[PDB]
């Protein structure tokens, strides 16, 4: 029978090179028209055929990857090898060698390797889903967020979704068992969403094909109890913030709030998009008395959000007051002197 | 490259009925298109070569279909093995691409309308050392399956309470549960100062079909503590840029609830303002509140008295903070 | 269908010959000890174990019970370990029950038990650690096979 079977190293270090063997079975690649394809699978994303070997050194590559890819074949061996240039976490994925026989589509693969790219070992082994990044999305764009478990059997506990938005309650959203991906969706969510799961990269994910503006809200993926508190959410990542709207990234002006026994002073931090933006009195020396907003969300559709003090009324004109801005997604950064007008 | 597009993502159809599934090439790829089904923990299995023909061993109830640009998979009668995802690949030009995928499911029985948990008092006003009751009511019976979590602000859920009357990991005696059957309760007694959260309440009496409460919120009770108003004239810089925002500041007042009231030159302002307030203070138990009101430079200019107007319990009458434009 | 045969009182003792105890809120875990300890630590350590006769042999059908106040009976549903508060019937209706595990020998390891859930086929319980303490669950192991799924079974009569 025909078969293919890889090999090579679980893990990579960043900037270091993978090489995976293809051991085959069944046909020869000298001796045939058939030909052997790398193909690799990142949790959560398309299949992406990386490169093709036909007899006699017949190679053929994915253009935006050629410069780090290399496919060979040891002219005894019945082996075609794939060495990969400078790797990155986002080459971490499941690679599959795979046949193009005489039908033109992959009828063989082979059962596939698992590559990660990682730097080093922090936080474990405690028991942890954690959560893919804040997202800012525009209305109708696709999106799919991601929870990895760790420091148990993610493969064998349900996980569920969950929806919180702004200033509401938990909504139960759907589950997934990690291990087989079988999913029990909630009635309001059935056909909203896709709930699913890469079983070898303790993942699940969650996704939407066209995001609306009410799909803006914070995001929790939770484990269910299973023996100890079964049923329930045991554990949980730290969410994921989901913003949808039609607003572009700007920067925001920052603005003094001149004072005047006890004298109020502050920064506007105004038109901004989109949140977060930290404030920082005196950077760090100020915290007593401070109080920083929450912002608001202007018709505009850019946030404004004020940062106060109250101090002596006497260090006024002594002592120096300035409000550290960083709105860190458009790279905006202000430290802004406040005085008595 | 060619980009080979699915949908839908996930498609629900019953037992022995019809599963139809779509790819759209975004360029032609005369009929060079192969379908492969995979299943968790193995490798993509091909179904379907050149648009429609048939991979040998492949049961007759898969077939596919197109040419050009619009592509379909059917399977004509669905069986539970068939639960898996469904990729379309194109090897008309290289790169050779695949599409996203659609994943398979059966459409499972419609389920029971869902039981509703109502939580009461929304707010709880109660002080440090006292003892809070938090109530929870299920529109049916769930016997002791209820769960009790605690929400601090910015953070995630925490399970407290399991069975409706058992603690979770690390929770402290003084968190008490109770109730079976319709009627719940959430009694902490000494209340401390990291015990001041919201409250959810979930039933899990039928898994999967969980629904949560829509909480109660806990919050410091103290001594009524009146505002002190502070109102903030537009700078100088913002005034270039052709817009006015005037801020009046409530700083550290209680309870929660005040009135703010914009005027320019005695006209009550309405539509023009917003607002926020901050989380109760961790040391002194109040509130603060931020109120913005914003003007076009024309009409800023066009004026000269702009005053709030304060209103708090801890205020016998209220209070006006104001200044005179120029002065 | 199922029909019980007898209960044993018995030790359920995982792979690092860790004893099986469910406290308070139903929550199964493994502890080092001597079987006087476990005989000690009764009813928390001590299960009553129901052999049931099988109209289809696959093979010895079993339901796995605690005493507290009251009794709870092991369950499997959802592929969720639970202890449902209820006493193992005489007789059960299908050929797949939550509660009926299958007990078998493990192939080529000498006295080792397998427990496979009858509603779940190739899913068997097994022991996780959950950072410090060993806990009870349902894994599927027809591809793994982990040494996990290995439980000594001791009778306390
Ligand atoms: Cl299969």
Redo the contacts between chains.
Sequence with gaps: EVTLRESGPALVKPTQTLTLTCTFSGFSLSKSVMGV?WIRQPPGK????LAHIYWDDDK?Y???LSARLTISKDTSKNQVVLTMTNMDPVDTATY?C?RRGI?????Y????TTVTVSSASTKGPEVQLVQSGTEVKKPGESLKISCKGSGYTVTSYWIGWVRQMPGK????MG?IYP???E??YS?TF??QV?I??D??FNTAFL?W?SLKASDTAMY?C?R??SGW?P????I????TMVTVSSASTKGP?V????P?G?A?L?C?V?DYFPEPVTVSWNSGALTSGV?T????L?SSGLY???S?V?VPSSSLGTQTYICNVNHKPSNTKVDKKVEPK | ?IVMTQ????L?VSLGERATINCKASQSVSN?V?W?QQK??Q????L???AS?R?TGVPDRFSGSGSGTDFTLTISSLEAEDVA?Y?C?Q?YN????????T?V?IK?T??AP?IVMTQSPATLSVSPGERATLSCRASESISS?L?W?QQKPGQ????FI??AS???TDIPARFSGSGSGTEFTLTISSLQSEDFAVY?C?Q?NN??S??????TRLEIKRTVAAP?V?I????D??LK?GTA?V?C?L??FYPREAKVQWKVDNALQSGNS?????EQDSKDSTY?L?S?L?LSKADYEKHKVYACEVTHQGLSSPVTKSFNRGE | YFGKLESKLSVIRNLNDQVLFID???RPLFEDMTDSDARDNAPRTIFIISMYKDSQPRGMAVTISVKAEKISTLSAE?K?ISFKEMNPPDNIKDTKSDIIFFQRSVPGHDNKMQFESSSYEGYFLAAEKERDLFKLILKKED?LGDRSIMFTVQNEA
């Design positions: 394809s398309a299949l992406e055929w053929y994915n253009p935006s599959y795979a039908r033109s589509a992959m009828d693969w082979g059962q596939g309650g938990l909504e139960w589950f291990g087989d991906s999913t029990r009635p059935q056909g896709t699913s799961a079983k070898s996704q094909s929790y939770a269910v109890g508190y049923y329930t959410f045991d949980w990542g730290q969410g002006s603005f003094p709030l001149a005047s006890t109020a502050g506007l105004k109080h907003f929450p912002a608001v202007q404004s959000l004020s106060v109250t | 490259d949908s839908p993502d996930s629900a060079d192969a492969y968790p923990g490798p993509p299995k091909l379907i070569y050149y023909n991979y995802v990729y690949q090897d290289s790169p050779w691409t695949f599409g996203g995928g994943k499911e499972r419609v389920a869902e399956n769960a979590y995630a859920p925490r399970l399991y069975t058992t603690r979770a959810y979930q899990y898994w999967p969980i629904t949560f409460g829509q909480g002190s502070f903030f004239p537009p700078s810089e913002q840029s925002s801020v500041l700083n550290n917003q607002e926020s307030v901050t603060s931020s913005t914003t | 308070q809120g139903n959802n969720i591809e």
